[PDB]
Amino acid sequence: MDVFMKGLSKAKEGVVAAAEKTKQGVAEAAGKTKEGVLYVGSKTKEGVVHGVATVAEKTKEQVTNVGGAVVTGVTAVAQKTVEGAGSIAAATGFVKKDQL
Amino acid sequence: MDVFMKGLSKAKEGVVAAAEKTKQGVAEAAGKTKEGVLYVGSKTKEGVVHGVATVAEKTKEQVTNVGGAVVTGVTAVAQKTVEGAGSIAAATGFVKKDQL
Amino acid sequence: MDVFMKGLSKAKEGVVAAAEKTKQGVAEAAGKTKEGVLYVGSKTKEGVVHGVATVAEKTKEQVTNVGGAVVTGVTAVAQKTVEGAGSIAAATGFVKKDQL
Amino acid sequence: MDVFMKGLSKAKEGVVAAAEKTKQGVAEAAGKTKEGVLYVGSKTKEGVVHGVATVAEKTKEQVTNVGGAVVTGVTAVAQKTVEGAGSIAAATGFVKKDQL
Amino acid sequence: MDVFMKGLSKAKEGVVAAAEKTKQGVAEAAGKTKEGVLYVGSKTKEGVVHGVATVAEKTKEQVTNVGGAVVTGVTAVAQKTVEGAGSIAAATGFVKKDQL
Amino acid sequence: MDVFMKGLSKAKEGVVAAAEKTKQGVAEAAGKTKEGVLYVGSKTKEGVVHGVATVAEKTKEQVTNVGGAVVTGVTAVAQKTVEGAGSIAAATGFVKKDQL
Amino acid sequence: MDVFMKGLSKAKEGVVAAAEKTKQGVAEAAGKTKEGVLYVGSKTKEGVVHGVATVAEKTKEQVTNVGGAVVTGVTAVAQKTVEGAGSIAAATGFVKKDQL
Amino acid sequence: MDVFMKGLSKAKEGVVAAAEKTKQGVAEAAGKTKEGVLYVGSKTKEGVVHGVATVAEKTKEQVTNVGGAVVTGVTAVAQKTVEGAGSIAAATGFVKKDQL
Amino acid sequence: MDVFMKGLSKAKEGVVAAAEKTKQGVAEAAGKTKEGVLYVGSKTKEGVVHGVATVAEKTKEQVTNVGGAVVTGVTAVAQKTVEGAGSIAAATGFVKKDQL
Amino acid sequence: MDVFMKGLSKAKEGVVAAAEKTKQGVAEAAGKTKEGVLYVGSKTKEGVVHGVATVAEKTKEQVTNVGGAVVTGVTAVAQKTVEGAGSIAAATGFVKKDQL
Amino acid sequence: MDVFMKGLSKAKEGVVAAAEKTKQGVAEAAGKTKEGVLYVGSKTKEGVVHGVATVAEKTKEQVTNVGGAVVTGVTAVAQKTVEGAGSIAAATGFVKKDQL
Amino acid sequence: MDVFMKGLSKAKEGVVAAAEKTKQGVAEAAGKTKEGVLYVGSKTKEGVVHGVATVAEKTKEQVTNVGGAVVTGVTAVAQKTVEGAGSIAAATGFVKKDQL
Amino acid sequence: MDVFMKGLSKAKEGVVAAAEKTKQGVAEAAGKTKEGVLYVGSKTKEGVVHGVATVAEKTKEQVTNVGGAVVTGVTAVAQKTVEGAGSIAAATGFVKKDQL
Amino acid sequence: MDVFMKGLSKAKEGVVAAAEKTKQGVAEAAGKTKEGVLYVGSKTKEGVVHGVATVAEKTKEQVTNVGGAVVTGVTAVAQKTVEGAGSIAAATGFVKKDQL
Amino acid sequence: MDVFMKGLSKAKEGVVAAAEKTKQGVAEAAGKTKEGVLYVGSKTKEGVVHGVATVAEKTKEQVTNVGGAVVTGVTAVAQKTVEGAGSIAAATGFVKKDQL
């Protein structure tokens, strides 16, 4: 009555150029819980921005965003409010409770 | 009465150029729960933005967004409010409870 | 009375160029629950934006979004409100409860 | 009385260029539940935007969205309100409860 | 009645050029919980920004953001407020409680 | 028994682009007289002359006028001759002669 | 028994681009007289002359005028001749002669 | 029995780009007289002359005027001749002669 | 029985770029007279002359005027001849002669 | 029975870039007279002359004027001849002669 | 049995100005044969070409031949082909074979 | 049985100005044969070419031949081909074979 | 049985100005043969070329030949090909074979 | 049985100015043969070329030949090819074979 | 049975000014043969070239030949090829073979 886990990665020509959260032979349990969280952001991989020209002869205002992945003008809230009573979050990877 | 898990990744010519959350031989349990969360963002992969010209001769306002993946002007809320009583979230990978 | 899981990835010429959430030999349980969440965003893969010109001679306002995948002007809410009593969310990968 | 699962991915010339949520030999349980969620967004794959010109000689307002996949001006809500009593969501991958 | 875990990484020609959170033979438990957190930021990998020219002849205001991945003008909050009573978050990797 | 005159010009977005002799809140008396005068001339506002080609292979004379508003070859006289006796010109804005 | 005059010009966004003899809150008397005068001339505002080509292969004479507002070849006289006796020109803004 | 005059110019965003004889809150009397005068001239505001080419292969004479506002070849006289007796020109702004 | 005049110029963002004879809060009397005068001249404001090419292969005469505002070949006289007797020019701003 | 005049110029952001005869809070009397005068000249403000090429291969005469505001070949006279008797020019700003 | 031949040229005033193949007392035999020959050419005697003018203003091609005797654009062949057997050409001046 | 030949040229005033192949007392035999020959050429005698003018203003090609005797653009062949058997050409001046 | 030949040239006033191949008392045999020959050329005698002017203003090509006798652009071949068997050419002046 | 030949040239006033191949009392045999020969050339006698002017203002190519006798651009071949068997050319002046 | 030949040249006033190959009393045999030869050249006698002017203002190429007799641009071959068997050329002046 045991627990056994492993991960092999025998590799000859391995290339992971521009990646994120890659698993190449693993064994996880990975329990996770999030009550109030918030992700804001822009990611780019193998992007190219070649040649940009902006002029303004006689103006009162001019804004500009050009990059490969842009995010502008956001307003977010993220909350969990337990104002009465009782709140439980288990988030268990795996349970093993066996008798004999 | 045991638990066994593994993952192999024998590989000869492997290429993962621009990727995200890739699994190439794994064994997971992966329990997860989210009460109030919020994702805002723009991602791009192998994008190209070549040649951009914006002018403004005599104006009062001019805005511009050009990039390969844009997000602008959002307003989001995300919440869980337990104001009375009682709230449970299990989110279990896998259970094994066997007798004999 | 055991549990057995594994994943193989013998590979000769593997190419995963621009991908997301790819599985190439896995074994999961994957319990998950979401009460109030919110996804907003724009993604692009192998996009190309070549040649963009915007001018404004004599105006009072001019906005512009050009990129390969755009999202603008959203207003979303996402909530779960338990104001009385009682709320349960199991979200179980798999159960194994066998006697003998 | 056991549980057995696996996934093979013997591959010679594999190409996954621009994809999302691809499985090439897997074995899942995958329980999932969502009470109140919300997806807003635009995705593009192998898109091309070549040649764009917008001018405005003498105007009071001019807006423009051009990209390969656009989304603009949305207003969504998504909620689950349990204000009385009682709410259950099982969302189970698979159950195995056998006697002998 | 023991616990056994390991990870191998026999490798001949390994290249991990520009990556993040990569695992090449591991064995984890990985319990984690987050009550109120907040991620804001822009990441880029193998990006190129070649050739940028912005001029302003006679104006009152002109802003500009050009880089490969930009994020501007955000306003986020992230909170968990337990103002009544009771709040628990387990977030367990894996449990093994077996008798004999 | 007084005289009162004024002129207001409260203005939010005022634009007078190409104009002449414009009054936007005034109070005048404006007496004027002209015995012998003479106006000759050409005026243009927001005119455009784009693309003009004139050739002359083998000629003895060739004249040309092209501009947006042309005036050519005039011969005018303007006179007032008082050779006897008596000539009066009042040209009064406004008179106020009241007794009591 | 007094005289009162004034002019206000409260202004928020005022623009007078290419104008002439503009009054935006005034109070005038403006007596004026002209016996013999003469105006000759060409005025232009916001004009554009783009692209002009004139050639002359083998000629004896070729004249050309192209500009936005042209005036050519005039011959004017303007005179007032009082050769006998008596000539009066009042040109009064406004009179106020009141008794009591 | 007095005289009162004033002019205000409270201004927030004032722009007078290319103008002439503009009044923005004034109070004038402005008596003026002209016996023999003469104005000749060409004025231009916000003009543009872009691209001009004139050639002459084998000719005896070729004249050319191109500018935005041209005036050429005028012959004017302006005179007032009082050769007998008597000539008066008042040109008064405003009179105030009140008794009591 | 007095005389009172003033002029205010409270100003926040004032811009007078290329102007002439502008009054922004004044109080004048301004008597003026002109017997024989003469104005000849060309004025330009915010003008542009870009690109001018004139050639002459084998000719006997070639004249050219190109500038934004040109004046050429004028012949004017301006005179007032009082050869008999009597000539008066008042040109008074404003008179105030009140008894009591 | 007095005379009172003043001029204020409270100013926060004042800009007078290229101007002439500008008054920003004044109080004048300004009597003026001109018998025989003469103005000849060319003025320019914010002008630009970019790129000028004139050639002459084999000619006998070639003249050229290019600048932003040109004046060429004028012949003017301006005179006042009092050869008999009597000539008066008052040109008074303002008179105040009140009894009591 | 002999052969006798002679030629006399007693001459007093002989003139041969411009000639060709002239005989003035001769005695010939003159055997001749020609199998394949070819004469091309132009001859002139006592010719005169006085005054020739050719011009070409603007053309793509112009050819000209003027001389007293011209020959242009010929294409001739001249041949004798004996490809079988037998070919004789005697061409004898004169034979004298007499017996006795 | 002999052969006798002679030629006399007693001459008093002999003139041979411009000639070719002239005989003035001769005695010939003159056997000759030509199989494949070719004469091309132009001859002139006592020719005169006085006054020639050719111009070309603006052309792409212009050829010219003027002389007293011209020959241009010929293409001739001249051949004798004996490819079988047998070919004889005698070309004898004169034969004398007499017996007795 | 002999052979006798002679030539006399008693001459008093002999003139041979410009000639070619002239015989003035001769006695010839003159056997000659030509298999493949070729004459190309131009000859002139007592020629005159007085006054020649050729100009080219602006062209791409201009050729010219003027002389008294011109030859241009020829292409000739001249051949005798005996490729089988047998070819004889006698070309005898004169034969004398007499018996007795 | 002999051979006798001679040539006399008694001469009083002999003039041979510009000549070629002239015989004035001769006695020849003159056997000659030519298999493959080629004459190219220009000859002139008593020629005159007086006054030649060629100009080229602005061209790409201009050729010119003017002389009294010109030859240009020829291409000739001259050959005799005996590739089989047998070829004879006698070319005899004169034969004398007489018996007795 | 002999051979006798001679040549006399009794001469009183002999003039041979500019000549070539002149015979004035001769006695020849003159056997000659030419297999492959080639003459190229220009000859002139008593020629005159007076006054030559060539100019080139602005060109890319200009060639010129002027002399009394010119030859330019030739390409000739001259050959005799005996590649089989047999070739004879006699070319005999005169034969004398007589018996008795």
Side-chain angles (χ1 to χ4, degrees), chain C residues 35-67:
Chain C
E35 313 289 306
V37 313
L38 181 137
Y39 293 77
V40 175
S42 71
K43 328 177 178 184
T44 179
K45 287 147 185 167
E46 285 202 43
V48 156
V49 176
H50 171 283
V52 166
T54 72
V55 315
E57 192 56 6
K58 279 197 276 288
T59 70
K60 308 311 170 193
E61 176 160 348
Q62 173 197 231
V63 314
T64 298
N65 320 299
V66 165

Side-chain angles (χ1 to χ4, degrees), chain M residues 75-88:
Chain M
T75 319
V77 299
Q79 48 186 339
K80 171 185 183 187
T81 75
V82 178
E83 201 204 38
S87 191
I88 297 96

Side-chain angles (χ1 to χ4, degrees), chain B residues 63-85:
Chain B
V63 314
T64 298
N65 320 299
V66 165
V70 314
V71 165
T72 171
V74 315
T75 319
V77 299
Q79 48 186 339
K80 171 185 183 187
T81 75
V82 178
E83 201 204 38

Side-chain angles (χ1 to χ4, degrees), chain C residues 5-82:
Chain C
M5 52 168 58
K6 51 186 285 277
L8 263 281
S9 151
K10 303 179 185 168
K12 198 67 186 53
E13 305 319 274
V15 167
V16 185
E20 153 179 349
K21 299 180 194 168
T22 69
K23 305 178 187 186
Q24 280 195 316
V26 308
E28 318 168 280
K32 171 150 84 164
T33 173
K34 312 178 183 169
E35 313 289 306
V37 313
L38 181 137
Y39 293 77
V40 175
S42 71
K43 328 177 178 184
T44 179
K45 287 147 185 167
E46 285 202 43
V48 156
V49 176
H50 171 283
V52 166
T54 72
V55 315
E57 192 56 6
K58 279 197 276 288
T59 70
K60 308 311 170 193
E61 176 160 348
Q62 173 197 231
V63 314
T64 298
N65 320 299
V66 165
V70 314
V71 165
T72 171
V74 315
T75 319
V77 299
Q79 48 186 339
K80 171 185 183 187
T81 75
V82 178

